[PDB]
């Protein structure tokens, strides 16, 4: 009985996601809502994404450079600079600035629609919310996560190059020539898969929590907080699983 | 305002997919030059 309580919400989320997939592959797509939600997520989670990605990659590059300079092998730093940035820094900054901003925004928007009885207004008009609202939001979440992951990886690599060369006086040719030493097609492919899955899961969780808001006076805030916590936990677990799968393939081996 | 939103989304998507394609080109070792195919015979390729 103790496990049966969260299992009901788990089943509701899973059934809602199954219906979302069915509406995506069966019913006509909502291009207008998809465009609107894509631009909304981009405008709500682009500047924070850079503002979190730039200092974090600078910190990682600084730590790697000092540790390797003491180690003596300061010419292979770019290798690590690539290896983290493609496979962990990109998807994890995507996790943070998607779950914090876009997932919470989707949950708040759908909760606002629910408490204002707009969902019931759609439902009494014969329309299905899962096809008109959830599908464009999940697709927009996936698209924005993909693009943001690409931008994060690129900006992180460039910032690491500039910091290491112009501050810690490492050699630029060693940075650019060692980037591909440990990173190849498997790493960028697993990064793309991570970003796509993270965006899809964040969109699904945000939509499901927004549709099932409790109203009241703290229901929307509680729903947003629960959305954020669930997204962080689920995306970290999925990142662990996908990291294991990706290192099973490997560029070095 | 859907036209302007489409314009902005298209430009932003083009730039960020250019970045993703650039990452794929850089880390996938993609070349765009015309090449001719030759063959060679080795007793041992030494891990090539």
């Amino acid at each position: 009985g103790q496990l049966e309580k969260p299992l009901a919400t788990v089943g509701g989320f899973f059934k809602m996601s199954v219906m979302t997939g069915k509406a995506l592959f069966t019913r006509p797509f909502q291009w207008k809502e998809f465009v609107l939600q894509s631009w909304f997520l981009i405008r709500v989670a682009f500047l924070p994404t850079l503002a979190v990605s730039i200092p974090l990659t600078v910190l990682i590059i600084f730590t790697l450079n000092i540790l390797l300079a003491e180690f003596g092998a300061a010419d292979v730093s770019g290798a690590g600079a690539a290896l983290g940035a493609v496979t962990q820094l990109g998807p994890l900054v995507t996790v943070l600035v998607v779950a914090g901003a876009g997932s919470t925004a989707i949950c708040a928007d759908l909760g606002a629609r629910t408490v204002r009885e707009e969902i019931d207004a759609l439902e009494v008009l014969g329309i299905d919310p899962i096809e008109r609202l959830v599908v464009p939001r999940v697709v927009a979440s996936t698209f924005v996560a993909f693009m943001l992951n690409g931008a994060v990886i690129t900006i992180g690599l460039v910032g690491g190059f500039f910091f290491g060369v112009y501050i810690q006086n490492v050699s630029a040719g060693a940075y650019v020539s060692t980037l591909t030493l440990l990173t190849g097609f498997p790493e960028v492919l697993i990064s793309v898969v991570k970003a796509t899955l993270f965006g899809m899961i964040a969109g699904l969780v945000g939509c499901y929590r927004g549709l099932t808001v409790a109203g009241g006076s703290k229901g929307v805030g509680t729903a947003v907080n629960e959305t954020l916590v669930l997204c962080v936990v689920a995306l970290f677990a999925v990142n662990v699983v996908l990291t294991t799968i990706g290192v099973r393939f490997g560029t070095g081996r | 305002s859907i036209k302007g939103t489409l314009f902005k989304l298209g430009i932003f998507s083009l730039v960020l997919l250019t970045f993703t394609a650039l990452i794929f080109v850089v880390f996938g070792q993609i070349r765009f030059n015309r090449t001719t195919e030759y063959s060679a015979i080795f007793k041992n390729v030494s891990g090539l």
Partner: peptide, 17 residues
């Protein structure tokens, strides 16, 4: 594009020379 030899073979700004 045609002469693209890699990110390691592109001239970089800064440094001596």
């Amino acid at each position: 594009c045609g002469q693209w030899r890699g990110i390691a073979n592109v001239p970089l700004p800064g440094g001596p020379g």
